[PDB]
Design a protein around this ligand. Structure first.
Ligand code: LQN
Ligand code: LQN
Ligand code: CL
Ligand code: CL
Ligand code: CL
Ligand code: ZN
Ligand code: ZN
Lengths: 153, 153
């Protein structure tokens, strides 16, 4: 039923379009689209708390964490709602994104509409980095590009 | 209370930050902030339907019109939900925005979260232009800058 979209932009060359679709009121969310201008390899892919771009991607705040848990991979029970794991950029710097997630939603208390999607500088270590940062941010580093998650055609 | 924000960006020099605050459900919404890089005078100020920036401000679609009415001024009964009227840019091209509106909301079926705020090339004629365009767009012309309306700190 409900279809949202997100246009990723930042200070650098990284830009993309990510779609979200949810058929059932609390069923799985299909996240798909393309990001380009990325370094080859893994990049952290998170929903951050605020749809606030007043001071670039920084204003988005931390990973959307309504249940006040520690950072993890999407398949971990201990995770932020916004912890969608990694996207993989090919040799040409293009990440063809396709994710199914059941913790995020386009309705309820886990709604990500009016919040920020961020693609990060490095791989998300999924909380296995053995430092304080790993259990907060997954050591994914700086925010290359972000966008507010909005209602789509 | 509920507090949302919007960062207006486009292809040109027009850019701004607009805040929305609503103390009571079905109460008035305080819209305030600053826009710069505008021509001196009036500029159409509307919430458009989609939080979609896939092809710039064009992808936002028409004025948010859930009740399928004709375009009007904010004070008109016959108006789009998104019809917030005009903002006034001073000689230096800065519009100091301060609006109170009771038709828009940050909750319900009139919720503007995940939709687009647009500032337009010319004055909104408030539906008094006596042509088909007046009763659709208010003849405000091109979309100088837009942003998806997101949840704020
Ligand atoms: Se989805 C979302 C994003 C940001 C803020 C709020 C929301 C949201 O829709 N939350 C929400 C909370 C509680 C109830 C509703 C709701 C949705 C649909 C309906 C109805 F009438 F269509 F069935 C009623 C209530 C939405
Ligand atoms: Se604020 C927001 C942003 C995006 C999507 C949905 C919302 C939202 O909060 N919706 C919402 C909140 C509270 C109540 C309703 C609601 C909608 C319809 C009806 C009725 F009467 F039509 F069935 C009742 C309540 C929606
Ligand atoms: Cl975090
Ligand atoms: Cl890992
Ligand atoms: Cl982070
Ligand atoms: Zn996290
Ligand atoms: Zn209108």
């Amino acid at each position: 039923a409900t279809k949202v979209v997100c246009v990723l932009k930042g200070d650098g060359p990284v830009q993309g379009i990510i779609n979200f679709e949810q058929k059932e009121s609390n069923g799985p969310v299909k996240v798909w689209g393309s990001i380009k201008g990325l370094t080859e390899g893994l990049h952290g892919f998170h929903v951050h708390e605020f749809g606030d771009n007043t001071a670039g991607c920084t204003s988005a705040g931390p990973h959307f964490n309504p249940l006040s848990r520690k950072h993890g991979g999407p398949k971990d029970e201990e995770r932020h709602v916004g912890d969608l794991g990694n996207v993989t950029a090919d040799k040409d710097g293009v990440a063809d994104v396709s994710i199914e997630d059941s913790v995020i939603s386009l309705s309820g208390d886990h709604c990500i509409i009016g919040r920020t999607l961020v693609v990060h500088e490095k791989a998300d270590d999924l909380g296995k980095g053995g430092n304080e940062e790993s259990t907060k941010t997954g050591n994914a580093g700086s925010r290359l590009a972000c966008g507010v998650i909005g209602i789509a055609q």
